[PDB]
Amino acid sequence: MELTPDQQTLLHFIMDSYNKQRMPQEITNKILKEAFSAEENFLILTEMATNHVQVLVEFTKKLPGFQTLDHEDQIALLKGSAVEAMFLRSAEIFNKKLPSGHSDLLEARIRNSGISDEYITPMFSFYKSIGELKMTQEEYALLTAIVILSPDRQYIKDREAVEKLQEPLLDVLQKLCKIHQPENPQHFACLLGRLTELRTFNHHHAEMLMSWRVNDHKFTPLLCEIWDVQ
Amino acid sequence: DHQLLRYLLD
Ligand SMILES: Cc1cc(Cl)ccc1OCc1nc2ccc(F)cc2n1[C@H](C(=O)NC1CCCCC1)C1CCCCC1
């Protein structure tokens, strides 16, 4: 049931790459310090998402075997996973322990950010369900890698080549669930099942962004390539 | 079409 020396090597390598992301405390400190207008909050999201995509591309490039894949499939994997990775990272930040009352204010600040009520409810439903799983940093890093190397993505020419890269990451995650949560044997299937709910945000992400209570929906050229906007 | 993504990847 224990990790092999190769799997421990793979896990620490994924962890070092995952940790190069913007610190959660840095993000929560800005949202908790001052209450911003819907216009200011849209600009905050656009800058936050641009940095996330940039760091995600660097994390994706370091995933073992990713560089050996067909260049057209590489783009298909990045484009098909960018939104899901953003929501998984947002869920991780939201569930990080904060001093008494700060998490209540964080939720209230996100509710009043500018997004339509229609989209706020399923977003918090996902964050709370991810939170009830009580995932470790290693589980978040592997799940992100598993999301990126999904063979079921649109326009993928060689599905088997993507499968071969995802399988060792799924194996490491399964072993970590058994070690971290031996009390809950449903833990690994719980995480995997939460990826289908993650996929639902892809279909409605463009509608979610355009429904933001602002006059101008301005996006960066990089965000326009990753999202179905402008 | 996705030249910024292609650039960051390569
Ligand atoms: C991810 C996402 C997609 C769409 Cl369409 C709409 C909205 C959204 O994020 C909501 C959301 N859920 C959050 C939970 C915890 C948190 F600290 C910040 C969160 N955010 C937004 C954010 O900065 N997200 C970034 C997180 C890092 C990776 C890139 C994205 C802030 C924007 C400023 C107004 C308060 C919400």
UniProtKB/TrEMBL annotation, chain B:
Location of the protein in the cell: Nucleus
Functional description taken from the UniProt entry: Nuclear receptor coactivator that directly binds nuclear receptors and stimulates the transcriptional activities in a hormone-dependent fashion. Involved in the coactivation of different nuclear receptors, such as for steroids (PGR, GR and ER), retinoids (RXRs), thyroid hormone (TRs) and prostanoids (PPARs). Also involved in coactivation mediated by STAT3, STAT5A, STAT5B and STAT6 transcription factors. Displays histone acetyltransferase activity toward H3 and H4; the relevance of such activity remains however unclear.
Family: Belongs to the SRC/p160 nuclear receptor coactivator family.
Protein name, entry field: Nuclear receptor coactivator
Organism: Homo sapiens
Full-protein positions shown: 745 to 754 of 1399
